[PDB]
Structures are given as C-alpha cells and as structure tokens.
C-alpha cells in the first residue's frame, strides 16, 4: 500500500547527525549554512524552499533560492539536481544520506544517480541494467533515458 523499502533512506533522524557534518566542506557550502543550529534546522529550511511553487523551467531560480536561504553553493545545487533527474522529492534524501554516511555523493541510494550508474545505463549490458533497475526502478530508468536522449 503506502509502504516502500525506500523509506529507510528518508527515515534518517537529523538529530543523530552532529552539526556541522564532517562532509559539509566550505567548497560545497556557504558561511550561512554553518550558522544553522542543528541538522534538523537546516533540513527544515531545505524542505521549506524545496516545497515552493516552482514551474519546471525555474531550475535557475531554485538554485539561487537554495544558495540564499540554505547556503548551498549554486554549483553544488546544480550538480545535485542533475544526479536527481530533477526530482525535488529526493532532495532531502540526498543530504540526509550525504551527512549520515559522510560521503559525497551518496553511492548506493535509490534516486541518486552516480557517475558509475550512468556508465551502466550507457552500456547495453543486461547484467549492469538488471543491477541498475533493482536500485532505481523502471520509473527512474525511463526518466534517466528520457533525460539523456534530450541532453
């Protein structure tokens, strides 16, 4: 029903993540970011911005608003959006896993398309493609295909 084995990736408690996280370096984040009180406070503002009434074109606006309101460097916000295929829903999932596991980008997270994931999609190898679809699903698979034949 309303159950998914993907919940474990969104279910991360921000109160268990010490602020600022060791992975949150100055080359990815702005001085404002380091002035949030908790990981929860940052997460809550991230959700606030992400939940704006943006039209699919306004990717440039969102990247600016993430920079001004949450202190995420513009280049890093763009990189994240690209590997997320534009899906704003998986934006908080990125940061939760990036901070918890102390890895940028999170390697094995559904919806977070690594470089090696794209190399597997580029190859017509049905073994690599079975591993990919078992990670992101046919939904994200057809979205990534649609995304790159248009790239």
């Amino acid at each position: 029903s309303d159950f998914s084995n993907e919940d474990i990736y969104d279910n991360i408690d921000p109160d268990t993540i010490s602020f600022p996280p060791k992975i949150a370096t100055t080359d990815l984040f702005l001085p404002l970011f380091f002035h949030f009180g908790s990981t929860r406070q940052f997460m809550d503002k991230l959700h606030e911005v992400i939940s704006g009434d943006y039209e699919p074109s306004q990717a440039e606006k969102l990247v600016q608003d993430l920079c001004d309101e949450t202190g995420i460097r513009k280049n890093f916000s763009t990189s994240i959006l690209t590997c997320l295929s534009g899906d704003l829903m998986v934006f908080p999932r990125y940061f939760l896993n990036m901070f918890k596991d102390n890895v940028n980008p999170p390697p094995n997270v559904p919806g977070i398309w690594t470089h090696d994931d794209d190399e597997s999609l580029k190859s017509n190898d049905q073994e690599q493609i079975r591993k990919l679809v078992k990670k992101h699903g046919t939904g994200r698979m057809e979205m990534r295909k649609r995304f790159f034949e248009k790239d």
Binding site: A59, L81, G86, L88, D151
Partner: peptide, 13 residues
C-alpha cells in the same frame, strides 16, 4: 544557464 534551462524540475504535490 546552459544546464539549468535544459533541466526540468519535478515539483511537490
């Protein structure tokens, strides 16, 4: 501007 105009957002319900 190049990657951002080409990129499409998937907003929240």
């Amino acid at each position: 501007f190049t990657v951002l105009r080409k990129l499409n957002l998937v907003p929240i319900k």
